[PDB]
Write an enzyme that holds these catalytic residues in place. Sequence first.
Site, PDB file in Angstrom:
ATOM      1  N   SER A 273     -12.235  19.554  30.751  1.00  0.00           N
ATOM      2  CA  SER A 273     -12.053  21.267  30.646  1.00  0.00           C
ATOM      3  C   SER A 273     -10.185  20.832  29.695  1.00  0.00           C
ATOM      4  O   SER A 273      -9.437  20.288  29.319  1.00  0.00           O
ATOM      5  CB  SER A 273     -12.019  21.351  32.457  1.00  0.00           C
ATOM      6  OG  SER A 273     -13.106  22.283  32.616  1.00  0.00           O
ATOM      7  N   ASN A 274     -10.559  22.081  29.157  1.00  0.00           N
ATOM      8  CA  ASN A 274      -9.011  22.561  28.503  1.00  0.00           C
ATOM      9  C   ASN A 274      -8.466  23.857  28.858  1.00  0.00           C
ATOM     10  O   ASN A 274      -9.705  24.267  28.904  1.00  0.00           O
ATOM     11  CB  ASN A 274      -9.492  22.154  26.360  1.00  0.00           C
ATOM     12  CG  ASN A 274     -10.046  21.079  26.304  1.00  0.00           C
ATOM     13  OD1 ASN A 274     -10.040  19.967  26.688  1.00  0.00           O
ATOM     14  ND2 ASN A 274     -10.870  21.106  25.169  1.00  0.00           N
TER      15      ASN A 274
ATOM     16  N   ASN B 230      -7.197  17.867  31.849  1.00  0.00           N
ATOM     17  CA  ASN B 230      -6.925  17.488  32.948  1.00  0.00           C
ATOM     18  C   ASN B 230      -6.589  15.894  33.096  1.00  0.00           C
ATOM     19  O   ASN B 230      -7.148  15.260  33.916  1.00  0.00           O
ATOM     20  CB  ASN B 230      -8.892  16.481  31.949  1.00  0.00           C
ATOM     21  CG  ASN B 230     -10.290  17.414  32.587  1.00  0.00           C
ATOM     22  OD1 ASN B 230     -10.264  17.765  31.447  1.00  0.00           O
ATOM     23  ND2 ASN B 230      -9.983  18.113  33.432  1.00  0.00           N
TER      24      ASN B 230
ATOM     25  N   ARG C  50      -7.744  14.459  23.847  1.00  0.00           N
ATOM     26  CA  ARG C  50      -7.719  16.459  24.395  1.00  0.00           C
ATOM     27  C   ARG C  50      -6.471  16.646  24.635  1.00  0.00           C
ATOM     28  O   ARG C  50      -5.892  17.445  23.927  1.00  0.00           O
ATOM     29  CB  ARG C  50      -8.685  16.545  25.301  1.00  0.00           C
ATOM     30  CG  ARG C  50      -9.976  15.979  24.825  1.00  0.00           C
ATOM     31  CD  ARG C  50     -10.865  16.762  25.851  1.00  0.00           C
ATOM     32  NE  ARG C  50     -11.030  15.988  26.754  1.00  0.00           N
ATOM     33  CZ  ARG C  50     -10.634  16.443  28.213  1.00  0.00           C
ATOM     34  NH1 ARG C  50     -10.485  18.048  27.574  1.00  0.00           N
ATOM     35  NH2 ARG C  50     -11.134  15.846  29.349  1.00  0.00           N
TER      36      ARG C  50
END
Lengths: 546, 164
Positions: free
Chosen positions: A1-2, A269, A297
């Site tokens: 997830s972001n 995360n 990310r």
Amino acid sequence: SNAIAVGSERSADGKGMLLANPHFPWNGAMRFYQMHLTIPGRLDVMGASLPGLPVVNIGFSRHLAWTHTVDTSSHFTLYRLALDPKDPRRYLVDGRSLPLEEKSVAIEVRGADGKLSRVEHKVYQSIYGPLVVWPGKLDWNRSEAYALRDANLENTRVLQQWYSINQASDVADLRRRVEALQGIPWVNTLAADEQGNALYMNQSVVPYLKPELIPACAIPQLVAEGLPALQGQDSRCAWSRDPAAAQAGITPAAQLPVLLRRDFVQNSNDSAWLTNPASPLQGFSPLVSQEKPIGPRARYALSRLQGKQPLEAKTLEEMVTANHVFSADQVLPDLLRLCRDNQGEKSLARACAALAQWDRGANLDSGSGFVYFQRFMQRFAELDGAWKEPFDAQRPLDTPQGIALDRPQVATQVRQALADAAAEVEKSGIPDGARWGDLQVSTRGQERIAIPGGDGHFGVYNAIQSVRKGDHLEVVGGTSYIQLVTFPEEGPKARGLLAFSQSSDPRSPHYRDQTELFSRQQWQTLPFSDRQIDADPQLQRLSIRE
Amino acid sequence: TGLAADIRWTAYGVPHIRAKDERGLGYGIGYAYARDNACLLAEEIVTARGERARYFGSEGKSSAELDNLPSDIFYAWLNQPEALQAFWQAQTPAVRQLLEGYAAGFNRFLREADGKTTSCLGQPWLRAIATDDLLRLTRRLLVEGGVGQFADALVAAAPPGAEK
């Protein structure tokens, strides 16, 4: 997830903005569903929820938007039991032999003949919880066994917690509501409000041990491997009871990471540490947050977020829709140099040409370079000391970087890895003319829809996980519910999509409609006000009662 | 009874549920959800009840990719009657009402379903749900960051035999 929350100091309009990009399965019990809930006068909230839950899990309301990402905190502990040397079904606590409890369950099984048989199974339990076995690592032999205490088994507050979030007014209110109840099981929360506050909270249900107990209560070798494991033969290693905690044995809200700013907060995360590098979060229990190197990310997001440039909704949207393979930027320049150094090497020709032509993306029209890159990185991850600049804690945003091709053994191993990756790609059944969107798809009935994005482990912000099925890579999880919320004067403006569409049923009009749009990366209005809802030409209404 | 909701759908089948209370709100949610995802919820409830092997045999898997029998053992252990009861008793009136409404609304859709948006019409596992089934789903989600990750490991745990 972001997740990215932007505050008044960086947003173009001086108000709050939130990008929500959770990465979750495209099927099953954790498949997101869009809905808007209103009890006029006291509740008005819109977002996405998980199957069977009568609350919004990620959403927005008049002055607030919030989202979640999976955190790095422990939500359980393993306990290594010291078994009674005379009886492997007994275990020692402070030198005293205690019996395991046995709980039998009975299951009905439909056989080949179509008839049901009854199967009984014995579950062994300790004072900590049930025993667990990982053959070859967590065994149950005559010396030791492992039990597992899950902190969320006692968390009866989870539904009340989201219902409370659903009623929250602004960032300050959301924080009070989460810290008060401590009902969030295993996620971070990030939020922005109209007034321009950006909030990160690592506020979940986490086993509590007082600081001084940790060095002796940890199983050092398992904790170093990221497993929360404690000594089950010492009563002093029981979770600590602090009366300020909402639940006996969990970490009080004051001891969990929170960051409230007016510029930005982000999470992809990793731990709380580098939520915003201008204000690192440090000094927490290893069960809560550690200063571990960030994944690609977050490194990508921070490379885009740092500095003084205005952040527009367009900026955040394009961080998703760019499909930039950020892991390429640490290694591809050197990989291309290696290629040029080896132009007389036939085993490398196709790979090197693909890598040179590649746009460094996971777009539909990105070339086969991405496939060669993926297979290469899988092998690169296994090489020892191949980084030109290894991870530097002093430079946690810019390291590791480069391939150490000036070390002869590295040059050899890297070239071999590229050759092996190339062999694997060419051994598959794909022509070099095929592009990424020809390969990665989501099946809908007898049809397939091309899906942009790639694995988060390769630094693609638009993370998409896929598995080989038939002749294609079938999407199984990743970018799911997308919500980008700003707060202009008229009311919240929310934009996004549900990538896999509202309905899992092939018969539905809403089985693939948003998936077509996701393929084209065309986000849409999420209508929230009565004006917006009434303006929709597709508007339908039904009232029901019993 | 005392269940009423007003539902508006906008583009892409996004429902907007309006009600005067939690029961009515849950009624609208469960009904709208069932229209889109009845089969999905029915399947996942079978999983959370530990009844996969009963409907599908031992060769199948859950949507979490666990074998049916080990999955069933794990969920029967997790969602024992006493655990569900204790969980229910700890719920606020508002949450109990949301759950009562949801079950009733889902069930309303099932009574009127004719296959228009329901591919599993006629399957024995597509059936009326109870608030306990929603608690089973909630507890399944709750442990996804904990013992749920060790479901196979819990099932595999047996004392040693006579071995050297």
